[PDB]
Amino acid sequence: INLVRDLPQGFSALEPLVDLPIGINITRFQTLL
Amino acid sequence: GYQPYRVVVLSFELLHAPATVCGPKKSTNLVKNKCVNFNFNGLTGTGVL
Numbered sequence: 001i002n003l004v005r006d007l008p009q010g011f012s013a014l015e016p017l018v019d020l021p022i023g024i025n026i027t028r029f030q031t032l033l
Numbered sequence: 034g035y036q037p038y039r040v041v042v043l044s045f046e047l048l049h050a051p052a053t054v055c056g057p058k059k060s061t062n063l064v065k066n067k068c069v070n071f072n073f074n075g076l077t078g079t080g081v082l
């Protein structure tokens with residue numbers, strides 16, 4: 001979406017790139033740089 | 034008594050972790066224009082193509 005600044009708009013959808021059939025204890029998502 | 038005769042014995046789980054990836058197209062080829070009850074395991078194909 002060609003944008004410049006401060007426009008959190010845009011409407012679309014998503015496909016499952018990967019389904020890792022792990023089924024593990026998941027509630028923490030530390031996202032780091 | 035001791036000649037080399039090696040064996041690898043196997044075992045499957047009592048489901049400690051469910052299956053990973055399931056069966057492939059153990060299949061024959063395609064068909065056409067004549068209704069064929071066929072199975073995709075999720076798309077029971079019954080009717081003409």
Ligand SMILES: *[C@@H]1O[C@H](CO)[C@@H](O)[C@H](O)[C@H]1NC(C)=O
Pocket residue numbers: 023024025
């Ligand atoms: C973590 O995953 C295991 C997998 O069997 C499950 O049995 C266990 O209950 C999970 N732990 C929590 C806190 O949900």
